[PDB]
């Protein structure tokens, strides 16, 4: 079985190896399409502490094609790591990052204490704490208005029943596992009425001549003997057909 050279791979490294991680309430969404999804590299990588795939087999997701891949990347606490799951509830699951119950995709989370935690406390990550209602699945809310717990208007002034909806994380190297910062990226697979150019890598095998073999060139499959050809093809043509509709 033979396929063209694997090129134009999806920029998965640009998300996982990003120098900055988005906030829980302001998770960074990246779209990947028309590229080779090197899913096996992430699957075999041991740098991830949590690797949960819903609706797709972790060992066979490279064989699944989707219209697009949406990478939602953020930094959260360890205790909130379990909150990133379909059907889950919590502060982050309802106000910062909400996942649908029937979500299809893979969530990969890894501790980033050595990279995100700071001695003085890394407060650059903020999560929504107070909100009027639970956020919709895959909904990004970044409103900074002071939350009004009661009927008294805040008028831009903090006070009774007027608390800031966003809370910062106390990420420190001396913090516990549940309090240590962890970077979580959820790859959601969107499949609509599209050609779905986003696909995983295709295996390639060494070529054999002058022997009955089962050959698979891209979409053309058959069995026969492959020999050197003296014919000339047009640059855009891939295979030649005989007068009896036979390759």
């Amino acid at each position: 079985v033979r396929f063209p050279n694997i090129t134009n791979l999806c920029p998965f490294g640009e998300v996982f190896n990003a120098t900055r991680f988005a906030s829980v309430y302001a998770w960074n969404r990246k779209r990947i399409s028309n590229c080779v999804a090197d899913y096996s590299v992430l699957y075999n990588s041991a740098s991830f502490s949590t690797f949960k795939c819903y609706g797709v087999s972790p060992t066979k997701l490279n064989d699944l094609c989707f219209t697009n891949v949406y990478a939602d990347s953020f930094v959260i606490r360890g205790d909130e790591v379990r909150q990133i799951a379909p059907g889950q509830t919590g502060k982050i699951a309802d106000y910062n990052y909400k996942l649908p119950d029937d979500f299809t995709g893979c969530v990969i989370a890894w501790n980033s204490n050595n990279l995100d935690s700071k001695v003085g406390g890394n407060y650059n990550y903020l999560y929504r704490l107070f909100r009027k209602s639970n956020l919709k699945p895959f909904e990004r809310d970044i409103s900074t208005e002071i939350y009004q717990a009661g009927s008294t208007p805040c008028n831009g002034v903090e006070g009774f029943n007027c608390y800031f909806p966003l809370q910062s994380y106390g990420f420190q190297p001396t913090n516990g596992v549940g309090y240590q910062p962890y970077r979580v990226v959820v790859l959601s697979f969107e499949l609509l009425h599209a050609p779905a150019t986003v696909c995983g890598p295709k295996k390639s095998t060494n070529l054999v001549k002058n022997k009955c073999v089962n050959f698979n060139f891209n979409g053309l499959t058959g069995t026969g003997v492959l020999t050197e050809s003296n014919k000339k093809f047009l640059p855009f043509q891939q295979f030649g057909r005989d007068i009896a509709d036979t390759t």
Partner: antibody, heavy 123, light 108 residues
Framework: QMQLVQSGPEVKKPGTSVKVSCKASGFTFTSSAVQWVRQARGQRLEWIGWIVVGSGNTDYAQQFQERVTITRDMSTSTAYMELSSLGSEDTAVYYC????????????????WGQGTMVTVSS | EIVLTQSPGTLSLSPGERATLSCRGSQSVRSSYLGWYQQKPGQAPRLLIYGASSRATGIPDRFSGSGSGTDFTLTISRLEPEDFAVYYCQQYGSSPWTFGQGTKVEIK
């Protein structure tokens, strides 16, 4: 209605950094503030301050800095406040109060009570 | 900071008659963030009036509170044995919090 829980009787000696907790039940203790009050025996009371339990944001008086500090515990939903450098004339009782309101869309007042912590000092 | 002073100390009034209590501040405050609240001699305080126009939960209709500018007042038309208490005046907007100065409505 809600229900606040504090410590009970307390007899101490001057100079001891006293430690008092205040927990809540019956309403969402997620990020609602907690306001603290001290009052001597039959004597008029004055202002201690308040704490934002969601992020642990402390606010106190001009006289209660560098001697009071308060921490947060979401596990038992308790505000843990301590005093340092007390005095022999500081016999009083301490109360805590959260905005009395049920749910996320609730009222505004501070209606209900805790249990009260009696601090008695002698010698 | 802002400092308030309230009705003077140890005033005794006969039960069943009108009682009025006053609170005045050196600096102007906002009425939308105002509150008068009661405290028994030996028990935690209780909110009575907030905003000078809204009656607080659990408060009888006979209690009323009002005022404007720097001068605010609290009135009870008929005194009950549940009126032997101390009343407090406070504003609760931004960072300054000014708790009550104390006014004991007593029993003859």
């Amino acid at each position: 209605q809600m229900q606040l829980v504090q410590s009970g009787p307390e007899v101490k000696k001057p100079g001891t950094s006293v430690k008092v907790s205040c927990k809540a039940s019956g309403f969402t203790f997620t990020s609602s503030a907690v306001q603290w009050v001290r009052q001597a025996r039959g004597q008029r009371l004055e202002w201690i301050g308040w704490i934002v339990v969601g992020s642990g944001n402390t606010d106190y008086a001009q006289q209660f800095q560098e001697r009071v500090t308060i921490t947060r515990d979401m596990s038992t939903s308790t505000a843990y406040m301590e005093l340092s450098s007390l005095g022999s004339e500081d016999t009083a009782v301490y109360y805590c109060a959260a905005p009395n309101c049920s749910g996320g869309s609730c009222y505004d007042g501070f209606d209900l009570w805790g249990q009260g912590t009696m601090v008695t000092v002698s010698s | 900071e802002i400092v308030l002073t309230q009705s003077p100390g140890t005033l005794s009034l006969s039960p069943g008659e009108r009682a009025t209590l006053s609170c005045r501040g050196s600096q102007s405050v906002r009425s939308s963030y105002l509150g008068w609240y009661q405290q028994k001699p030996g028990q935690a305080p209780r909110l009575l009036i907030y905003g000078a126009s809204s009656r607080a939960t659990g408060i009888p209709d006979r209690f009323s509170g009002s005022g404007s500018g720097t001068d605010f007042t609290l009135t009870i038309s008929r005194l009950e044995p549940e009126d032997f208490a101390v009343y407090y005046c406070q504003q609760y907007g931004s960072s300054p919090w000014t708790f009550g100065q104390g006014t004991k409505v007593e029993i003859k």
